[PDB]
Amino acid sequence: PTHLSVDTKFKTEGLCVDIPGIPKDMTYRRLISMMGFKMNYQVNGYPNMFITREEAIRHVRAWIGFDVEGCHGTNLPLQLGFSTGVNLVAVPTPLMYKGLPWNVVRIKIVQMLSDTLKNLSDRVVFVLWAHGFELTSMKYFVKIGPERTCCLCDRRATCFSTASDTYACWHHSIGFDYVYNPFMIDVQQWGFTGNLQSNHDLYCQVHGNAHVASCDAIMTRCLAVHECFVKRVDWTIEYPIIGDELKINAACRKVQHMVVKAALLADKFPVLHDIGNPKAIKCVPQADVEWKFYDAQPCSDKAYKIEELFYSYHSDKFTDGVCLFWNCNVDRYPANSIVCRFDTRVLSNLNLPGCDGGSLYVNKHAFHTPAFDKSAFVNLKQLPFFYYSDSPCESHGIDYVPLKSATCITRCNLGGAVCRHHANEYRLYLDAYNMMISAGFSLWVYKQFDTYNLWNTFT
Ligand SMILES: COCC(=O)Nc1ccc(O)cc1
Ligand SMILES: [Zn+2]
Ligand SMILES: [Zn+2]
Ligand SMILES: [Zn+2]
């Protein structure tokens, strides 16, 4: 059972207000036919327009909430809402666009999905809370058929042009008018009691209902994200590389080793409490320190309460030494900490919008992270940039412009002039640091941290 069967039953109760007298007994096959699409028995890689929850989770980057609200059904004009915040009005003659015919509306839809998804995914998945109009309106902007490749590249086709009779991916679809072979999933098929707002509002206060179609489209995708990534967590699903994932993860490993090595040299803590990943290894394996591990998985709902991680009866004394919280999101960190906390507000192709202020960070695996809260770090300060190194000054083996910096903490810089080796290593580390910061990670440290205490290790 790879794909969803077209002979699977579809509960049509949520459709009977827009579609009165709809058969209670309904399959995907009959629904697709009712929507105006002919599948003609096609074993060409597109078995069903509707997909399973497991396939939807594998393609979370393609999710676009979609909702259609009648303003007045081929007689009345429809308001099309997308989780991008766009509202288009179609006439059959929170960005609100005036009533325009379908032939020009469909052009805007391909432009919008292409610009939203070209750097995210090879497809679109319309996430629905289906009442009728969104499915019946799909025939005015969707064309289906066999799986195809782009006319200008090797990616799968996601768009079609009537003007040129050709197919394109999101990167080459300029001027295309049809959405080609889209995917869709109805959240209402998952078994919920009550309307969209009542289910969404149970888990989210950040999205409201200004009573437009895009509001519902946003609430739909947020409810889907809550169900598939907040309450249900599967860390065994891998995701393709769509950006700087390899560089960001290597930058995070270098920064961690650096920052923890220097805190241990500067303040010589006798014990380090490493709270987080149950699979974590010592990031500074040569340190003298008593390294103690505490397991806590990444929290996806709310950030951990420090009282429930530390108390209820390890050294038991977390107040001795330093606490390391590398991506272990808590409500309020203790004052003796080193913290890497992902900032959910960051705008990037890896960070997708989430539930209740949180975000879905997709790098190798999907991690719904709770909302970034500035008050979590009141007992700490922002960790300032510095590069520290005790390694010998020796070139071995790119050209050179002499490096002058107050934050290159090395024997050569103490001695008055940074050597070539430490200058290459400084600029490589600064690049990894800027990568890590721009990916959304924020660094914080105990208030007594001072890089001035690092020069004394050059005696
Ligand atoms: C389908 O998954 C393919 C893959 O290898 N993905 C991957 C993503 C990020 C990363 O940092 C390393 C690997
Ligand atoms: Zn292409
Ligand atoms: Zn929400
Ligand atoms: Zn040097």
Curated annotation (Swiss-Prot):
It catalyses: a 5'-end (5'-triphosphoguanosine)-ribonucleoside in mRNA + S-adenosyl-L-methionine = a 5'-end (N(7)-methyl 5'-triphosphoguanosine)-ribonucleoside in mRNA + S-adenosyl-L-homocysteine. The active site is at residues 67, 69, 134, 211, 216. Residues 49-230 form the ExoN domain. Zn(2+) 16 binds at residues 393, 412, 419, 422. Residues 239-459 form the N7-MTase domain. Inhibited by Remdesivir antiviral drug (GS-5734). Zn(2+) 14 binds at residues 150, 153, 169, 172. Mg(2+) 2 binds at residues 69, 211, 216. This is Guanine-N7 methyltransferase nsp14. It comes from Severe acute respiratory syndrome coronavirus 2 (2019-nCoV). The gene is rep. The chain holds residues 5949 to 6449 of 7096 of the full protein.
